[PDB]
Amino acid sequence: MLTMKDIIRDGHPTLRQKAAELELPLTKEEKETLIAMREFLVNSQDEEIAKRYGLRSGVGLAAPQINISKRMIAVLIPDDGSGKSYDYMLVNPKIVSHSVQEAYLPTGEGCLSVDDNVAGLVHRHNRITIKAKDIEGNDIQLRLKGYPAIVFQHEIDHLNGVMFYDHIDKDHPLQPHTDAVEVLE
Ligand SMILES: CC(C)(C)[C@H](NC(=O)Nc1cc(F)cc(F)c1)C(=O)N(CC(=O)NO)CC1CCCC1
């Protein structure tokens, strides 16, 4: 069972490396890791389990965050009230196209690997198309917009050694870009 102790902290060199492509099929150990990454997210969203093991409520996790430099991610976003929810374990995900229009969370972002809040807007693409493999090596193509697009971009960034605060404007951290969509949390 993964917990907060498995999550490495900002400053750990693995978080700044470029994660390696997975060869398909995955090994059993790689499947188990990816399943446990999702299970961490499932556990973190269960009120009682999260309380018992001191878990922060997570919507995404990238393998580098548990010190595994491999291009795998898990995303678990519960129903936003519209019936849309996102439960994906992705292997070698890649943004193949995106909107020019940007989007941002109004209060900025945070990260399982970052202890202290960092104020400032993180502009990402409002719309993205991702190609990836699933855990069994089958093909997945996702068309994403708004909040889930932001989450997936955040996770893919981890695979390239990019941290959310890298995107914050030092002088004008709270100024939205022209025509950027404010995305409701
Ligand atoms: C850093 C943390 C606060 C744990 C964040 N969770 C989060 O925002 N959860 C959340 C918010 C809600 F409004 C309702 C709800 F059910 C859960 C998160 O998991 N991540 C994932 C991460 O660390 N990926 O590497 C950070 C998010 C900030 C923007 C996208 C991902």
Ligand SMILES: [Zn+2]
């Ligand atoms: Zn993160």
